[PDB]
């Protein structure tokens, strides 16, 4: 299959995600950054602890279905 | 009340089923959790420290959880490589691969200065599945794989953003055999590129049960280190808690530099010791404590007459580090004979010989003519035919070492010297990557043994590895005396590098101990300079291939610049006079030219290939390691 669930949570909100393995994580990012209230360079988004950016892709990180990207401040 | 090891049944080690390091740390975090398993000293910020702890029930936690997400992202046999800075971390990474029966590969953080050669060396080696490291070096990790090819970017962890509840679907390996793979050891690479010895759980308890047996050590008997733990003597060190139930505490490297008082506090009686402090350190410990870890005047009382054990490895130990430490910390009554020095190696996983609890370091000299024709006999030290060799002390228990002629496989009577074979169940099984040297270096038969034979318990039909060093028995004791691949033949006739190079540096005050290589190259492969050169003794024969002596030296760093002429020609009569040899060509470059090793010690063959290619001459960065055809 092409698509994988993402889940993105910044310890409250959990919010689910899908998305193709070759698409960027930018349009993910910023519909969460905004979901929150928040503009998506007021939050850094973390895969294993490891920032990620806003053009790499699942398929760049080796995401699998129902993975969790972590998002904080700064 | 006389020692008993609680591992050992018979003379026997015994292992019941649970027996490898990660069923020994799961035991400990349920019979008693709460007590204290870890302890790092952060000097970071605080110049006298804090220290941050680990019990039992935590550590397991946070291997546990790390585990359980290394299970999701790689597969059995997968290495899993561990590029955190030295802190509870690392530790918590490399158990956490063990937990999850993958196979660990104890590296360093990549913005650590000057060891870049060593892990590429690594990686390119053993290719892991997984980076594991922290948030605080995430970014320096992320710039070093910058620097590797597209498809050797394996997928980085930060083990401490690895939730605990994580730990939930953690499975537990099964039973290990004696196949199953716990880690690779890394040797120095000092006589080539750092090979990997695969290391197994049952490697790995055998060594540390060897290692407690050695030491006479028990529960209350604290264990302290600020070795690397991607150093043979580093790791195996901070294993020892789970079986032996001591508590283990451990520094950085530059902690140790800065304030090497540290190592000396730590090692010092603490109110509430029921034990003795058993540590490890080469000999550039015991002379930079000496010399800048003495308390100042004034200063809280020191009292070291507690230390049990400071095992001394890697090198032979020298005569003149032994005399300074004791005279700087006799005084405060640390014992002579806590000063262990010992024989061990990575195919070994790190231990094979020390010295009896009893007794001291025995350094003693030898006829240097007895000792280039492979026989060891004592002279006087004020003889002029003195060469000084350390006592490595008693093989281990459940191991063995013999000393060899290779090429009949025969043991030698003690007194002779040949390649030091050494057999055990802590022998590792094998080189990765690499199955045919493993079969040439692990594989080996002992055709002959002497009566009374130092194989002595071992089956007949146990194999042997082949240490790459030569040594002999003398008076009871292990002796190295140097190593294989660096001994140098010429005429017909053998020279011992280090020996060599100590009358160089004796002859000149341009060289430096520690800063001087000694090796040979064939006639025809020496550079042009040496058949211009009248002093040479040697002209131009593109059919010559016998080996000539060569001398590479550093300067100081400043102090430029000086003649070559009679620096060469110093070098040059005084080895012509005392060896019977004479020297082709002395080239001497600026400081930090020649190639070294995880220690920091001269990698000669290295030196040699950078010599002959000639990075050196021309003043080239030299490649840290040699070609693998060397
Ligand atoms: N007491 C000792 N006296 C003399 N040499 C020692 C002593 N203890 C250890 N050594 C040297 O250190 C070696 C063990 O080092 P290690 O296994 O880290 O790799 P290495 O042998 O230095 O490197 P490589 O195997 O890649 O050439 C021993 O084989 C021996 O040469
Ligand atoms: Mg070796």
Redesign the pocket.
């Given at each position: 299959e092409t698509h994988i669930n993402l889940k993105v949570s910044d310890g409250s909100s959990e919010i689910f995600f899908k998305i193709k393995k070759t698409t960027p994580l930018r349009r993910l990012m910023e519909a969460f950054a905004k979901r929150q209230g928040k503009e998506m360079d007021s939050l850094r988004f973390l895969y294993d602890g490891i920032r990620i950016q806003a053009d790499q892709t699942p398929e760049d990180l080796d995401m699998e279905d129902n993975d969790i990207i972590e998002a904080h401040r700064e | 009340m006389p020692f008993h090891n609680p591992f050992i049944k018979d003379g026997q080690i015994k292992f019941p089923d649970g027996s490898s390091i990660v069923a020994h740390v799961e035991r400990w975090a349920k019979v008693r959790g709460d007590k204290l398993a870890y302890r790092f000293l952060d000097f970071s910020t605080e110049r006298d420290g804090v220290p941050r702890d680990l019990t039992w029930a935590q550590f397991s936690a946070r291997n546990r959880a790390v585990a359980a997400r290394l299970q999701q992202v790689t597969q059995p046999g997968d290495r899993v490589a561990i590029l955190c800075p030295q802190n509870l971390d690392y530790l918590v990474a490399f158990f956490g691969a063990l937990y999850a029966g993958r196979i660990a590969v104890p590296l360093f953080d990549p913005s650590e200065p000057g060891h870049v050669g060593r892990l590429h060396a690594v990686l390119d080696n053993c290719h892991p599945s997984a980076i594991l490291t922290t948030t605080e070096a995430a970014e320096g990790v992320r710039k070093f794989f910058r620097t590797r090819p597209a498809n050797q970017r394996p997928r980085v962890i930060a083990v401490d953003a690895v939730p605990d509840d994580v730990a939930s679907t953690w499975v537990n390996p099964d039973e290990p055999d004696e196949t199953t793979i716990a880690y690779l050891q890394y040797?120095?690479?000092?006589?080539?590129i750092?090979?990997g010895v695969q290391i197994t759980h049952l490697n790995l308890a055998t060594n540390v049960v060897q290692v407690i047996e050695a030491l006479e050590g028990e529960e209350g008997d604290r264990g302290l280190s600020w070795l690397p733990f991607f150093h043979?003597m580093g790791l195996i060190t901070a294993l020892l808690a789970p079986m032996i139930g001591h508590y283990f505490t451990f520094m950085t490297p530059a902690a140790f530099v800065r304030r090497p008082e540290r190592w000396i506090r730590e090692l010092a009686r603490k109110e509430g010791d029921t034990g003795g402090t058993i540590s490890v350190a080469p000999n550039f410990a015991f002379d930079h404590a000496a010399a800048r870890g003495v308390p100042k005047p004034g200063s809280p009382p020191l009292d070291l007459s507690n230390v049990k054990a400071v095992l001394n490895?890697?090198?032979?130990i020298s005569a003149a580090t032994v005399r300074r430490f004791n005279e700087a910390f006799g005084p405060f009554g640390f014992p002579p004979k806590a000063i262990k020095?010992?024989?061990?190696?990575?195919?070994a996983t790190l231990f094979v010989s020390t010295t009896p609890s009893a007794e001291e370091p025995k350094i003693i000299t030898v006829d240097r003519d007895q000792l280039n024709s492979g026989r060891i006999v004592e002279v006087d030290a004020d003889s002029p035919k003195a060469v000084a060799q350390?006592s490595?002390g008693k093989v281990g228990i459940a191991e063995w070492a013999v000393i060899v002629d290779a090429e009949s496989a025969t043991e030698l009577p003690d007194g002779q010297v040949g390649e030091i074979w050494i057999s055990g169940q802590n022998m590792g099984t094998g080189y990765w990557g690499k199955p045919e040297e493993s079969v040439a270096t692990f594989q080996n038969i002992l055709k002959s043994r002497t009566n009374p034979s130092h194989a002595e318990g071992a089956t007949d039909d146990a194999t042997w590895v082949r240490?790459?060093?030569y040594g002999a028995f003398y008076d009871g004791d292990l002796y190295?005396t140097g190593?294989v691949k660096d001994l140098v033949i010429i005429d017909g006739r053998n020279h011992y590098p280090q020996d060599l190079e100590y009358s160089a540096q004796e002859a000149s005050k341009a060289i430096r101990t520690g800063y001087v290589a000694a090796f040979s190259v064939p006639a025809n492969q020496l550079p042009d300079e040496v058949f211009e050169n009248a002093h040479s003794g040697i002209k131009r024969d593109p059919d010559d291939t016998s080996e000539q002596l060569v001398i590479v030296a550093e300067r100081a760093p400043g102090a430029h610049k000086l003649d070559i002429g009679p620096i060469t020609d110093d070098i040059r009569a005084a080895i012509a006079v005392r060896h019977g040899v004479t020297v082709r060509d002395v080239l001497l470059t600026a400081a930090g030219a020649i190639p070294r090793?995880s220690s920091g010690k001269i990698g000669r063959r290295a030196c040699r290939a950078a010599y002959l290619d000639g990075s050196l001459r021309a003043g080239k960065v030299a490649n840290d390691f040699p070609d693998a055809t060397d």
């Amino acid at each position: 299959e092409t698509h994988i669930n993402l889940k993105v949570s910044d310890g409250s909100s959990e919010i689910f995600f899908k998305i193709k393995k070759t698409t960027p994580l930018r349009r993910l990012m910023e519909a969460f950054a905004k979901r929150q209230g928040k503009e998506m360079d007021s939050l850094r988004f973390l895969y294993d602890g490891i920032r990620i950016q806003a053009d790499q892709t699942p398929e760049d990180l080796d995401m699998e279905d129902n993975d969790i990207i972590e998002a904080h401040r700064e | 009340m006389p020692f008993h090891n609680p591992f050992i049944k018979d003379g026997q080690i015994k292992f019941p089923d649970g027996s490898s390091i990660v069923a020994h740390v799961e035991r400990w975090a349920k019979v008693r959790g709460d007590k204290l398993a870890y302890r790092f000293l952060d000097f970071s910020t605080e110049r006298d420290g804090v220290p941050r702890d680990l019990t039992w029930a935590q550590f397991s936690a946070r291997n546990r959880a790390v585990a359980a997400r290394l299970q999701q992202v790689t597969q059995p046999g997968d290495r899993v490589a561990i590029l955190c800075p030295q802190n509870l971390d690392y530790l918590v990474a490399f158990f956490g691969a063990l937990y999850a029966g993958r196979i660990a590969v104890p590296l360093f953080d990549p913005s650590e200065p000057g060891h870049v050669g060593r892990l590429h060396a690594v990686l390119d080696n053993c290719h892991p599945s997984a980076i594991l490291t922290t948030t605080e070096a995430a970014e320096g990790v992320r710039k070093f794989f910058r620097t590797r090819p597209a498809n050797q970017r394996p997928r980085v962890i930060a083990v401490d953003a690895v939730p605990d509840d994580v730990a939930s679907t953690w499975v537990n390996p099964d039973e290990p055999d004696e196949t199953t793979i716990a880690y690779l050891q890394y040797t120095s690479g000092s006589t080539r590129i750092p090979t990997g010895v695969q290391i197994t759980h049952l490697n790995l308890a055998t060594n540390v049960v060897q290692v407690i047996e050695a030491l006479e050590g028990e529960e209350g008997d604290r264990g302290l280190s600020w070795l690397p733990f991607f150093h043979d003597m580093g790791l195996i060190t901070a294993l020892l808690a789970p079986m032996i139930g001591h508590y283990f505490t451990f520094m950085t490297p530059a902690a140790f530099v800065r304030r090497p008082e540290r190592w000396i506090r730590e090692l010092a009686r603490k109110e509430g010791d029921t034990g003795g402090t058993i540590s490890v350190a080469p000999n550039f410990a015991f002379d930079h404590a000496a010399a800048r870890g003495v308390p100042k005047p004034g200063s809280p009382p020191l009292d070291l007459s507690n230390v049990k054990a400071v095992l001394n490895g890697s090198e032979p130990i020298s005569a003149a580090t032994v005399r300074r430490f004791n005279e700087a910390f006799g005084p405060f009554g640390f014992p002579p004979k806590a000063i262990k020095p010992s024989y061990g190696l990575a195919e070994a996983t790190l231990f094979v010989s020390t010295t009896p609890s009893a007794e001291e370091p025995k350094i003693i000299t030898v006829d240097r003519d007895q000792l280039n024709s492979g026989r060891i006999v004592e002279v006087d030290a004020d003889s002029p035919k003195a060469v000084a060799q350390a006592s490595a002390g008693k093989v281990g228990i459940a191991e063995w070492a013999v000393i060899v002629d290779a090429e009949s496989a025969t043991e030698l009577p003690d007194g002779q010297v040949g390649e030091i074979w050494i057999s055990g169940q802590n022998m590792g099984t094998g080189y990765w990557g690499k199955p045919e040297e493993s079969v040439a270096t692990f594989q080996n038969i002992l055709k002959s043994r002497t009566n009374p034979s130092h194989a002595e318990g071992a089956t007949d039909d146990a194999t042997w590895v082949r240490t790459g060093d030569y040594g002999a028995f003398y008076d009871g004791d292990l002796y190295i005396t140097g190593r294989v691949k660096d001994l140098v033949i010429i005429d017909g006739r053998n020279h011992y590098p280090q020996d060599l190079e100590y009358s160089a540096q004796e002859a000149s005050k341009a060289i430096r101990t520690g800063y001087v290589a000694a090796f040979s190259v064939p006639a025809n492969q020496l550079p042009d300079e040496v058949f211009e050169n009248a002093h040479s003794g040697i002209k131009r024969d593109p059919d010559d291939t016998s080996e000539q002596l060569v001398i590479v030296a550093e300067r100081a760093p400043g102090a430029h610049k000086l003649d070559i002429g009679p620096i060469t020609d110093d070098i040059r009569a005084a080895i012509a006079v005392r060896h019977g040899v004479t020297v082709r060509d002395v080239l001497l470059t600026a400081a930090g030219a020649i190639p070294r090793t995880s220690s920091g010690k001269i990698g000669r063959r290295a030196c040699r290939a950078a010599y002959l290619d000639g990075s050196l001459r021309a003043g080239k960065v030299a490649n840290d390691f040699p070609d693998a055809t060397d």
